[PDB]
Amino acid sequence: KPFTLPILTISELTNSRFPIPIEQLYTAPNENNVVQCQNGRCTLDGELQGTTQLLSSAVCSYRGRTVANSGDNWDQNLLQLTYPSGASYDPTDEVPAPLGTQDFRGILYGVLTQDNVSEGTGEAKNAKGVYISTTSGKFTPKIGSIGLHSITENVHPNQQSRFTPVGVAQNENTPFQQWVLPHYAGALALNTNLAPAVAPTFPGEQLLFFRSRVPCVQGLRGQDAFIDCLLPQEWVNHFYQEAAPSQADVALIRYVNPDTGRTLFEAKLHRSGFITVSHTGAYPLVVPPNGHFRFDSWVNQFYSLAPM
Amino acid sequence: TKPFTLPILTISELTNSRFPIPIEQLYTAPNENNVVQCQNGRCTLDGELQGTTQLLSSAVCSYRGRTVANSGDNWDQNLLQLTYPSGASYDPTDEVPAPLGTQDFRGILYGVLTQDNVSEGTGEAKNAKGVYISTTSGKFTPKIGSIGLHSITENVHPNQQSRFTPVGVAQNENTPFQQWVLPHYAGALALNTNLAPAVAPTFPGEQLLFFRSRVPCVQGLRGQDAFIDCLLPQEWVNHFYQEAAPSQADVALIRYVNPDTGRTLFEAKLHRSGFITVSHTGAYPLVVPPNGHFRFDSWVNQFYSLAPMGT
Secondary structure (H helix, E strand, C coil): CCCCCCCCCHHHCECCCCCCECCEEEEECCCCCCCCCCCCCECCCCCECCCCCCCHHHCCCEEEEEEECCCCCCCCEEEEECCCCCCCCCCCCCCCCCCCCCCCECEEEEEEECCCCCHHHCCCCCCEEEEEECCCCCCEHHHCEEEEEECCCCCCCCCEEEEEEEEEECECCECCECCCCCCCCCCCCCCCCCCCCCCCCCCCEEEEEEEEEECECCCCCCCCEEEEECCCHHHHHHHHHHCCCCCCCEEEEEEEECCCCEEEEEEEEECCCEEEEECCCCEECCCCCCCEEEEEEEECCCCCCCCC | CCCCCCCCCCHHHCECCCCCCECCEEEEECCCCCCECCCCCCECCCCCECCCCCCCHHHCCCEEEEEEECCCCCCCCEEEEEECCCCCCCCCCCCCCCCCCCCCCECEEEEEEECCCCCHHHCCCCCCEEEEEECCCCCCECCCCEEEEEEEECCCCCCCEEEEEEEEEECECCECCECCCCCCCCCCCCCCCCCCCCECCCCCCEEEEEEEEECCECCCCCCCCCEEEECCCHHHHHHHHHHCCCCCCCEEEEEEECCCCCCEEEEEEEECCCEEEEECCCCEECCCCCCCEEEEEEEECCCCCCCCCCC
């Protein structure tokens, strides 16, 4: 089977690390960042890695049964997890955490829904705003449990519950750090089964990211909470479907404008599932709204890209 | 010609095209008094999107735009002046029922509005505003470019770029959730336009097969499920869009196969307009093996008699 990319414009792509559209392509040097996100990880021949699964609707979502955590002034309840599919989760599963688990340090914000309540109970009484913080000693998804900090109304214990992600938050002592992995089993345990860290090795090259702005419900005034993924969800899903054998270490890809039939820039798509471009410095790319990446040809790691 | 194909995905690898949550089960039932005319998850087998259908799950029942104050109103205290959910500017003269992804059911949609970021010291989730978007409000006019926001938790700022992220539905004392009743997209101002057509299983012994999810319900339906049923999962819509394989007949025969046994569990008709029928009578939730999936078999005569779906 020949390798292909889906034909999708920038506005037709979903971030693989949070359920929101891709807004731009962005390149920057790694500097002191370890680029080792666990969602949106997939090889060109269709092998999913890290905590990656197929559904955008499962990314940073959680499902399970609540249990009371009385006396704890942050996490008043815990969530006993399953997979987002509803299937049973066990810590012995060869994954860093249940598939779709957040892969950034900090506070994830969203809404927990539980047992339905009568109409007369009031407006959105089965909707509880919650913070899921990785700096909490209760953030241990690998061992099947996470802490829920309710903002207003009490979360009920012993109810089948779904967490729907909305954005991130930054409070006075919990910075949002997109390139720092959570301790999936808590601070006393090492992470397991990780998709590897990625970096450019060819001189003059940098990683290219698919960038989104994630809503931020507390903090980052006059700033944007960026979440940067290595592959859009659509690319992950396409490689998984196709499972086309990789013919070389690198797929040469070009961003084309079908309205003009011209190539705007080119990039190297590595077999392990990330992109490099020829550029030095932090830079937001100008892409035409109707443009798209296309597979050009198989090359090796030594291919010298036209400066972008 | 280019062969028609389905993506190879199990029941737990499918997304509802009418609400951004996974498909939970396959479900068949007679239409009865329901008019099946949903506007999200509508696509022909040869890849023509219809109604309010677009490609992103993150856009389904999502809204974007700018808030305006709506004074003197205890229900909609603010309005949202809409763009497309992509952020592209919206023109009411666009040949759409409403901006792509607009809710396609009557009742209350609940979610969170997020706006300009606030300082850390402002407090917890202060830039997260719980809102009801009701279709029975006279302010529900997405075709015209504006919808009403009913605040429940936290104050909505007027005059700010805003995103609405859907969480679930709600039913209050006088607003039932009716998944098969289309909203008035232009409220009281104009008749609905540009609609994807209604669907009915006219064939003897056949019923629609739905991709079913339970939508979270934040008010009402105690001891009941808020179901949202779609005609195609989002991944099928997107596949047909990508492939654009020419339809060779009115009906494609499809089979639900277990790869582990090789056996066909049941067969179904996948109609060129983008919906499925099965040979069964009565409301029935299907039990499929976790590893099973639909596959395209062949183009068949329009009068092809399906092997009974069975239980």
